Design an enzyme around this catalytic site. Structure first.
Site, PDB file in Angstrom:
ATOM      1  N   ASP A   1       0.978  -1.229   0.294  1.00 28.43           N
ATOM      2  CA  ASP A   1      -0.385  -0.276  -0.123  1.00 28.43           C
ATOM      3  C   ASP A   1       1.286   1.335   0.170  1.00 28.43           C
ATOM      4  OD1 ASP A   1      -2.873  -0.554  -0.137  1.00 28.43           O
ATOM      5  OD2 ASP A   1      -1.988  -1.895   1.349  1.00 28.43           O
TER       6      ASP A   1
ATOM      7  N   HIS B   1      -7.561   5.169   0.938  1.00 27.46           N
ATOM      8  CA  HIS B   1      -7.856   4.454   1.920  1.00 27.46           C
ATOM      9  C   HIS B   1      -7.797   4.638   2.985  1.00 27.46           C
ATOM     10  CE1 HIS B   1      -6.428   1.254  -0.174  1.00 27.46           C
ATOM     11  NE2 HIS B   1      -7.002   0.750   1.820  1.00 27.46           N
TER      12      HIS B   1
ATOM     13  N   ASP C   1      -6.026  -4.356  15.997  1.00 30.36           N
ATOM     14  CA  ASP C   1      -5.829  -3.804  14.712  1.00 30.36           C
ATOM     15  C   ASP C   1      -4.193  -3.300  15.230  1.00 30.36           C
ATOM     16  OD1 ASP C   1      -6.921  -4.259  11.731  1.00 30.36           O
ATOM     17  OD2 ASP C   1      -8.950  -2.735  13.111  1.00 30.36           O
TER      18      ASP C   1
ATOM     19  N   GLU D   1     -10.327  -1.102  -2.924  1.00 27.07           N
ATOM     20  CA  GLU D   1     -11.833  -1.956  -3.522  1.00 27.07           C
ATOM     21  C   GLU D   1     -12.930  -1.430  -4.575  1.00 27.07           C
ATOM     22  OE1 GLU D   1     -12.650  -4.670  -0.815  1.00 27.07           O
ATOM     23  OE2 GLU D   1     -11.338  -6.950  -1.968  1.00 27.07           O
TER      24      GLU D   1
ATOM     25  N   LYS E   1      -9.600  -3.119  -8.060  1.00 28.75           N
ATOM     26  CA  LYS E   1      -9.752  -4.345  -7.129  1.00 28.75           C
ATOM     27  C   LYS E   1     -10.827  -4.374  -7.355  1.00 28.75           C
ATOM     28  CE  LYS E   1      -5.722  -4.959  -4.554  1.00 28.75           C
ATOM     29  NZ  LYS E   1      -5.498  -5.007  -2.676  1.00 28.75           N
TER      30      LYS E   1
ATOM     31  N   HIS F   1     -19.391 -13.234  -1.878  1.00 29.92           N
ATOM     32  CA  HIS F   1     -20.503 -14.406  -2.150  1.00 29.92           C
ATOM     33  C   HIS F   1     -21.511 -15.064  -0.978  1.00 29.92           C
ATOM     34  CE1 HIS F   1     -17.665 -15.588   1.103  1.00 29.92           C
ATOM     35  NE2 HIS F   1     -18.356 -16.174   1.600  1.00 29.92           N
TER      36      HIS F   1
ATOM     37  N   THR G   1     -10.565 -10.655  -5.364  1.00 27.22           N
ATOM     38  CA  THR G   1     -10.092 -10.467  -4.366  1.00 27.22           C
ATOM     39  C   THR G   1     -10.531 -10.964  -3.436  1.00 27.22           C
ATOM     40  OG1 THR G   1     -11.068  -9.279  -3.071  1.00 27.22           O
ATOM     41  CG2 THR G   1      -9.085  -8.019  -3.946  1.00 27.22           C
TER      42      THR G   1
ATOM     43  N   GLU H   1      -6.122 -12.577  -5.265  1.00 31.18           N
ATOM     44  CA  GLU H   1      -5.425 -12.342  -4.346  1.00 31.18           C
ATOM     45  C   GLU H   1      -6.275 -13.358  -2.908  1.00 31.18           C
ATOM     46  OE1 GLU H   1      -6.387  -8.631  -2.665  1.00 31.18           O
ATOM     47  OE2 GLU H   1      -4.806  -7.501  -4.482  1.00 31.18           O
ATOM     48  N   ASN H   2      -6.398 -14.171  -2.298  1.00 33.73           N
ATOM     49  CA  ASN H   2      -7.179 -14.221  -1.621  1.00 33.73           C
ATOM     50  C   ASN H   2      -7.877 -13.267  -0.377  1.00 33.73           C
ATOM     51  OD1 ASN H   2      -3.794 -14.371  -0.301  1.00 33.73           O
ATOM     52  ND2 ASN H   2      -4.395 -15.424   1.498  1.00 33.73           N
ATOM     53  N   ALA H   3      -8.478 -13.763   0.163  1.00 32.91           N
ATOM     54  CA  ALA H   3      -9.806 -13.064   1.021  1.00 32.91           C
ATOM     55  C   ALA H   3      -9.149 -13.192   2.157  1.00 32.91           C
ATOM     56  CB  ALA H   3     -11.130 -13.296   0.538  1.00 32.91           C
ATOM     57  N   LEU H   4      -8.532 -14.560   2.988  1.00 32.03           N
ATOM     58  CA  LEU H   4      -8.487 -14.513   3.891  1.00 32.03           C
ATOM     59  C   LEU H   4      -7.143 -15.524   4.044  1.00 32.03           C
ATOM     60  CD1 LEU H   4     -11.917 -15.905   5.507  1.00 32.03           C
ATOM     61  CD2 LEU H   4     -11.121 -13.661   5.799  1.00 32.03           C
TER      62      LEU H   4
ATOM     63  N   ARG I   1      -0.619 -12.822   4.087  1.00 40.03           N
ATOM     64  CA  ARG I   1       0.183 -11.723   4.030  1.00 40.03           C
ATOM     65  C   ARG I   1       1.624 -12.115   3.930  1.00 40.03           C
ATOM     66  NH1 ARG I   1      -0.815  -6.567   4.030  1.00 40.03           N
ATOM     67  NH2 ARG I   1      -3.409  -6.937   4.110  1.00 40.03           N
TER      68      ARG I   1
HETATM   69  O1  LIG Z   1     -14.678  -8.804   5.718  1.00 43.68           O
HETATM   70  C1  LIG Z   1     -14.433 -10.189   6.104  1.00 43.68           C
HETATM   71  C2  LIG Z   1     -15.642 -11.021   6.226  1.00 43.68           C
HETATM   72  O2  LIG Z   1     -15.316 -10.899   4.719  1.00 43.68           O
HETATM   73  C3  LIG Z   1     -14.869 -11.393   3.763  1.00 43.68           C
HETATM   74  O3  LIG Z   1     -14.735 -10.381   2.225  1.00 43.68           O
HETATM   75  C4  LIG Z   1     -13.406  -9.955   1.281  1.00 43.68           C
HETATM   76  C5  LIG Z   1     -13.950 -10.370   0.340  1.00 43.68           C
HETATM   77  O4  LIG Z   1     -14.354 -11.835  -0.077  1.00 43.68           O
HETATM   78  C6  LIG Z   1     -12.526 -10.270  -0.237  1.00 43.68           C
HETATM   79  O5  LIG Z   1     -12.791 -10.317  -1.513  1.00 43.68           O
HETATM   80  C7  LIG Z   1     -11.794  -8.937   0.316  1.00 43.68           C
HETATM   81  O6  LIG Z   1     -11.079  -7.904   0.053  1.00 43.68           O
HETATM   82  C8  LIG Z   1      -9.929  -8.249   1.281  1.00 43.68           C
HETATM   83  C9  LIG Z   1      -8.083  -8.340   0.474  1.00 43.68           C
HETATM   84  O7  LIG Z   1      -7.867 -10.190   0.525  1.00 43.68           O
HETATM   85  C10 LIG Z   1      -7.342  -6.912   0.182  1.00 43.68           C
HETATM   86  O8  LIG Z   1      -7.614  -6.096  -0.548  1.00 43.68           O
HETATM   87  C11 LIG Z   1      -6.897  -6.869   2.532  1.00 43.68           C
HETATM   88  O9  LIG Z   1      -6.054  -6.347   2.326  1.00 43.68           O
HETATM   89  C12 LIG Z   1      -5.831  -4.906   2.765  1.00 43.68           C
HETATM   90  C13 LIG Z   1      -6.044  -4.236   3.438  1.00 43.68           C
HETATM   91  O10 LIG Z   1      -7.964  -4.276   3.912  1.00 43.68           O
HETATM   92  C14 LIG Z   1      -6.514  -2.730   2.486  1.00 43.68           C
HETATM   93  O11 LIG Z   1      -6.888  -1.780   3.854  1.00 43.68           O
HETATM   94  C15 LIG Z   1      -5.655  -2.366   1.635  1.00 43.68           C
HETATM   95  O12 LIG Z   1      -4.711  -1.236   1.908  1.00 43.68           O
HETATM   96  O13 LIG Z   1      -4.683  -3.091   1.040  1.00 43.68           O
HETATM   97  C16 LIG Z   1      -5.003  -4.737   2.222  1.00 43.68           C
HETATM   98  C17 LIG Z   1      -3.744  -5.565   1.291  1.00 43.68           C
HETATM   99  O14 LIG Z   1      -1.981  -4.777   1.199  1.00 43.68           O
HETATM  100  O15 LIG Z   1      -8.206  -6.204   1.814  1.00 43.68           O
HETATM  101  C18 LIG Z   1      -9.754  -6.959   2.228  1.00 43.68           C
HETATM  102  C19 LIG Z   1      -9.815  -7.420   3.801  1.00 43.68           C
HETATM  103  O16 LIG Z   1     -10.293  -6.086   4.410  1.00 43.68           O
HETATM  104  O17 LIG Z   1     -12.972  -8.417   0.239  1.00 43.68           O
HETATM  105  C20 LIG Z   1     -14.168  -8.445   1.405  1.00 43.68           C
HETATM  106  C21 LIG Z   1     -13.346  -7.474   2.424  1.00 43.68           C
HETATM  107  O18 LIG Z   1     -12.994  -6.003   1.973  1.00 43.68           O
HETATM  108  C22 LIG Z   1     -14.538 -13.161   3.837  1.00 43.68           C
HETATM  109  O19 LIG Z   1     -15.633 -13.475   2.015  1.00 43.68           O
HETATM  110  C23 LIG Z   1     -15.412 -13.067   4.733  1.00 43.68           C
HETATM  111  O20 LIG Z   1     -15.457 -14.508   4.657  1.00 43.68           O
HETATM  112  C24 LIG Z   1     -15.224 -13.018   6.022  1.00 43.68           C
HETATM  113  O21 LIG Z   1     -15.736 -13.638   6.556  1.00 43.68           O
END
Ligand SMILES: OC[C@H]1O[C@H](O[C@H]2[C@H](O)[C@@H](O)[C@@H](O[C@H]3[C@H](O)[C@@H](O)[C@@H](O[C@H]4[C@H](O)[C@@H](O)[C@@H](O)O[C@@H]4CO)O[C@@H]3CO)O[C@@H]2CO)[C@H](O)[C@@H](O)[C@@H]1O
Length: 494
Positions: A54, A94, A102, A187, A297, A302, A344, A382-385, A422
């Site tokens: 970032d 953002h 955090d 996003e 992004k 889902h 993502t 990318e992976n979400a988790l 990460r």
């Molecule tokens: O919110 C938790 C629940 O929701 C989850 O939904 C996710 C989506 O399914 C993803 O598509 C996700 O996007 C992520 C992504 O991996 C990444 O961009 C991540 O890290 C970011 C950071 O937050 C952000 O500030 C930025 O600077 O870049 C970082 C990477 O350097 O950000 C997202 C996570 O915040 O989108 C939502 C969340 O936006 C998940 O599917 C559910 O199962 C879960 O319970």
């Protein structure tokens, strides 16, 4: 026929790792130079092609308008280069973190938040009047409120400064991607499932269109369609943690399916798309004729996808229901600017989610990748988790190459890259990190580790009704049910 053992290089998928959050802290100071340096040596020695980081707006432009300090990021970049790694830069307009549980808190610039104290309608606002400070509402893109600038202009100027202060990394080919943040978490979506307001998975979310700038635009649009008195959804929409069937708006045969509902959802999702279009246009104006990809992004919503209402996609801004593809219009908009779709949520399986959530990540991925490839753009992911297990690495491997390897040349369907969430202490733990080195070798399709095209100037503006031609639902490409190249070394097609 192909020669046994020869793998064509077109099969190779680049693998990037996300740096820790705060790696340049809120004071614009790059600490732990020596530790970070050793994490990068490990990442490089694991075979990774690069890293993503970032570039936080609230760090760089903190002191005031157009007072940009790039020094710390210049260092970080010089180091990543010297470790032999490519760089993906997110233009992060953002906020990061800011909660109890955090790593870090990096807001958008302080002087923007001053403006918000007196004028809170610069923020996306729910039905109840709550303001989310994470990001500036698209409502304000073209509103000259920011010490004589508009929000789009601030995004241009910051990007111009980035280009001009990174001109050497850019001409050397050290920076390969610019991800343009278009929302919360970087996003392109509305902040409809905000944790700061009580959202919990798998809530339906809430519409975020109630700031006075967006409400003015709505009043105008709804009058011009011949129904002055049509309001934005109210109590019938429910609240963040409702279920679709407990609402009037999202139940089967609910308001979302009426003329009023369609009109509103069309507008709401069109505003998101127009915002994406105007932001990537500035990006394309700035980076034209450089060897660098531009990207947006898209979050993977889902949950409730197997419900008729697709309620959580709708609140997020993706008007994706039966017979209306909500992702293909976005991919078409992207194609106009020669940009990449970064999706993502690549690692998930349907069986890992609770049944009441009506959740279909596998099918969601297949729809979005398919629609992107059909608009002749690249799709990265990318992976979400955070995930460390074989099941997750094998699902990402399926999605990067959904018809497996092609021994006669580049595969039919291939993702342009994968960025892993990460870099962390959990990832470098001996066992975890051994599995990860197998995943990278598989991403590379058993080749050893190793450039983008020259960015074309944006094509002609597509008018809103030619973009709606893209909502025609279609059949997605067929997917394999397992990878060709699982992490265990085996081959399921002997
Ligand atoms: O919110 C938790 C629940 O929701 C989850 O939904 C996710 C989506 O399914 C993803 O598509 C996700 O996007 C992520 C992504 O991996 C990444 O961009 C991540 O890290 C970011 C950071 O937050 C952000 O500030 C930025 O600077 O870049 C970082 C990477 O350097 O950000 C997202 C996570 O915040 O989108 C939502 C969340 O936006 C998940 O599917 C559910 O199962 C879960 O319970």
């Amino acid at each position: 026929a192909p020669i046994p053992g020869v793998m064509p290089i077109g099969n190779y998928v680049s693998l990037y790792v996300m740096l820790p959050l705060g790696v340049v802290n809120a004071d614009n100071v790059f600490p732990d130079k020596e530790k970070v340096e050793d994490e990068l040596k490990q990442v490089k020695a694991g075979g990774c092609d690069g890293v993503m980081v970032d570039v936080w707006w609230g760090i760089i432009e903190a002191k005031g308008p157009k007072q940009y300090d790039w020094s710390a990021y210049r260092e970080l970049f010089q180091l990543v280069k010297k470790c032999g790694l490519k760089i993906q830069a997110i233009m992060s307009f953002h906020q990061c973190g800011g909660n109890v549980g955090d790593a870090v808190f990096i807001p958008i610039p302080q002087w923007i938040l001053q403006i918000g104290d007196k004028n809170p309608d610069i923020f996306y606002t729910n039905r109840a009047g709550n303001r989310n400070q994470e990001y500036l509402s698209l409502g304000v893109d073209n509103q000259r409120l920011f010490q004589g600038r508009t929000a789009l202009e601030m995004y241009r100027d910051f990007m111009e400064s980035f280009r001009d202060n990174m001109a050497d990394f850019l001409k050397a080919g050290d920076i390969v991607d610019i991800e343009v943040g278009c929302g919360a978490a970087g996003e392109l979506r509305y902040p409809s499932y905000p944790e700061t307001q009580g959202w919990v998975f798998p809530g339906i979310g809430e519409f975020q269109c109630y700031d006075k700038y967006m409400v003015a635009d709505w009043k105008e649009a709804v009058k011009q369609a011949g129904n002055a008195d049509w309001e934005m959804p109210g109590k019938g929409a429910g609240t963040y943690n409702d279920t679709p069937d407990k609402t009037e708006f999202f139940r089967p045969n609910g308001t979302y399916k009426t003329d009023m509902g369609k009109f509103f959802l069309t507008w709401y999702s069109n505003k998101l798309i127009i915002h994406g279009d105007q932001v990537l246009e500035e990006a394309n104006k700035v980076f034209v004729g450089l060897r660098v990809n531009i990207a947006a992004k898209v979050s993977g919503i889902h949950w409730w996808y197997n419900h008729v209402s697709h309620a959580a996609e709708l609140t997020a801004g993706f008007y994706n229901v039966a017979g209306r593809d909500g992702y293909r219009p976005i991919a078409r908009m992207l194609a106009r600017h020669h940009a990449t779709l970064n999706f993502t949520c690549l690692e998930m399986r349907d069986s890992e989610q609770p049944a009441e959530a009506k959740s279909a990540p596998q099918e969601l991925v297949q729809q979005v990748l398919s629609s992107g490839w059909k608009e002749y753009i690249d799709v990265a992911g990318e992976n979400a988790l955070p995930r460390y297990d074989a099941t997750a690495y094998n699902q990402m491997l399926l999605n990067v190459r959904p018809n497996g390897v092609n021994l006669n040349g580049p595969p039919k369907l291939k993702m342009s890259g994968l960025t892993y969430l990460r870099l962390s202490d959990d990832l470098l733990q001996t066992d975890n990190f051994e599995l990860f080195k197998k995943f990278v070798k598989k991403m590379h399709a058993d080749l050893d580790p190793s450039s983008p095209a020259v960015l074309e100037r944006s094509n002609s503006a597509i008018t809103i009704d030619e973009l709606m031609e893209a909502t025609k639902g279609s059949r997605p490409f067929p997917w394999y049910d397992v990878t060709d190249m699982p992490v265990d070394g085996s081959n399921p097609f002997d």
